[PDB]
C-alpha cells in the first residue's frame, strides 16, 4: 500500500468515482446534460457511441475539472448500451468510469455492474429535476410576458401552485440522496 499509492492512485479514482459516476461533482453534471439533452430525449435509433463520446470533452473543459490531472479525465469514458426495439434515451445510454491496471483489484466486475445499476436510477432523478425547472422557468416567464389582461389569472395561478406541490417534494428528495445516501 505504498508503491501502488505512489505509482497509481487508488484514492483519486475512488474520489472520481463519486463525482463522475455517482453525480457527485455537480457543476459538470449540469453542463454535460445541457449539451446532451437533445440526443437523450431521442431514442437510441439515431444515436451511435462516437458522437456522444465527443460531446463530453467540451463540457469537461468548460467546467472546473480542467485543473484535474489528465489521467482521471482520460479514465472517464462514455458507453452506449444494447440497442434493441423498445429503445428510449434514458434506458439506453450510460456514463462509465473504467478501471485498468493493478488498481482494479479494489473493484470486482460485478461491483462496477452494481455501480452502473445505481447510475441509471440517479440519472433518471437528475433528469426530472430539470424537467420541473423548465416548468418553473416557464411559469416565471409567462406571468411577466402574457399578463396584459386579467382573463388569464385562474388557469395561471392554479398551474403555479400545482408546480410548487411538486417542487418541495422533488427538491428535498434530491437533497436526501445528497446528504444521506
Amino acid at each position: 500500500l505504498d508503491v501502488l499509492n505512489k505509482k497509481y492512485s487508488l484514492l483519486d479514482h475512488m474520489q472520481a468515482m463519486r463525482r463522475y459516476l455517482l453525480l457527485g461533482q455537480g457543476d459538470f453534471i449540469r453542463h454535460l446534460m445541457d449539451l446532451l439533452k437533445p440526443e437523450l430525449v431521442r431514442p437510441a435509433t439515431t444515436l451511435y457511441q462516437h458522437n456522444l463520446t465527443g460531446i463530453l470533452e467540451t463540457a469537461v473543459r468548460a467546467t472546473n475539472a480542467q485543473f484535474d490531472s489528465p489521467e482521471i479525465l482520460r479514465r472517464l469514458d462514455v458507453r452506449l448500451l444494447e440497442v434493441s426495439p423498445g429503445d428510449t434515451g434514458w434506458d439506453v445510454f450510460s456514463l462509465d468510469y473504467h478501471v485498468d491496471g493493478p488498481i482494479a483489484t479494489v473493484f470486482t466486475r460485478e461491483c462496477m455492474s452494481h455501480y452502473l445499476r445505481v447510475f441509471n436510477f440517479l440519472w433518471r432523478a437528475k433528469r426530472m429535476e430539470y424537467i420541473l425547472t423548465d416548468i418553473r422557468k416557464g411559469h416565471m416567464c409567462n406571468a411577466k410576458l402574457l399578463r396584459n389582461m386579467p382573463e388569464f389569472s385562474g388557469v395561471l395561478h392554479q398551474c403555479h401552485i400545482l408546480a410548487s406541490e411538486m417542487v418541495h417534494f422533488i427538491h428535498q428528495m434530491q437533497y436526501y440522496i445528497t446528504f444521506e445516501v
Partner: protein, 420 residues
Amino acid sequence: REIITLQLGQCGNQIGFEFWKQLCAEHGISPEGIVEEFATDRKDVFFYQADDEHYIPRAVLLDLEPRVIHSILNSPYAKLYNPENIYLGNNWASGFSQGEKIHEDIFDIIDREADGSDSLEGFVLCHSIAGGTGSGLGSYLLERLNDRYPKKLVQTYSVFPNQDEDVVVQPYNSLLTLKRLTQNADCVVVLDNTALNRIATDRLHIQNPSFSQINQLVSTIMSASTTTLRYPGYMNNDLIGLIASLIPTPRLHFLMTGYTPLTTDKTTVLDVMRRLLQPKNVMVSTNHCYIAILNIIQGEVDPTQVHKSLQRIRERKLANFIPWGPASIQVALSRKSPYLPSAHRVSGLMMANHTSISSLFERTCRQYDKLRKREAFLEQFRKEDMFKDNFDEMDTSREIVQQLIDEYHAATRPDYISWG
C-alpha cells in the same frame, strides 16, 4: 451557470465594490487578478477567465453623479475589474428619464457582456431603493432587462428605505420602484436599513460610519448566498433551484435575509439552528407565517447533527408554518471557503419567504398615503410633472401594491383558492 452582476448608483456601486473586494479576498486572486497556489471550487460564476490571466469579473459599471465611484477608480481593485464601460440622481423621475434617453448604448454594454460569457444564469442588480442615484434608472433598467430577455433570471438585492431620517418624495419613489420590482422581477432580496443599523450599533458602538459597515454586512450575505453556486454541491449550483422553493407564485417573490452569526470580528448545527429561528437573529426587523424557509450551512458539519437538529426544530415548532401545503425550512450543506477567518466554524444563513414583510410594505404605503392625502410633499419636481402630468402611475403603483398586500394576506389564510 454563470452570473453577470450589474451595479449602478452610488450605493449600488458601493455594495458592488465591497462584494467584489470580498470575493477577491475570498478566492485565490490578487487585486490585479494574479493566481494563487491554493486555488472543489469554481471561478467561473462571477468571474470570466479573462485574457491577461486575471479572473476579471463581468461587472457593468454605471455612474450617475459620481463621487465614490471616483474613489473606486483610483483603487487596486480597479485592476481586478474594468472592461471599460463606464457611462454617465436625487429623484426617481430624473434617474428614470436619464436612463430612458440613453438606453441604447447601455443595452449594447449589456449585450457585450452577454456575448462575453458562454452561459448565463441570471442578472444580479446591485440596487438601492429610493437611494436617489440608484432610483429611477434602476427601475427603468429593470424594465429593459425583463422585457429584452424573458429567458433569464432577474435578481435585485434591495434595501428598505428607513434610515431614521430631508426627502419627502421618498415614499413616491419607493412606491414606483416597488411597482417595478413586483412586475418586472423574478425574485427580490430585500433587507432593512434600520435592522442592519440596529445590529451595527449593537455589535459595535459606531454611530457615524454606519454606511461602510452595512456594506460589509450585505457583501458577506451576498457571498454567503452564492457560495453554493461558486462551490460545487449537489443542488443550487444554479440560481433557479434556490429561487424555486421559496417562491410559490409570481407575486410572492420577496425574501427575508438571515445569517446566524452576526459575528466574525465549539459550535454545532443544533445550536445555530435554534439561534437562527428567532426574529432577532434575522437581519430584517395577527397571524404572521412563513411561506418557505431555506437554510444553507457551511462548516465542519457532522451529518448526524443536521438530522437531529431538524428533529428538535420539528417538535419544538420554533418556525412559522405554511397553511396551504408543505413548504418548510430545508437543510443545505456547503463547503467552508478557503481563506475565510476562523470564527464561528459552523456557520449558516437562511433565505425565507415571510408574510411579515407585508407589514413593512403597508407602513411605507401608509406614509405614501399620508403625504398623498396632504398633497404638499410632491415638491413639484419638474421631471415628476413632465414624466406624468396626471400622476396616474402613482395610482397604478398603489393599486399594484394593494393587490400585493391582499395576495400576502390571502396566502396567510388556510385557503389560497381565494386571491387578490
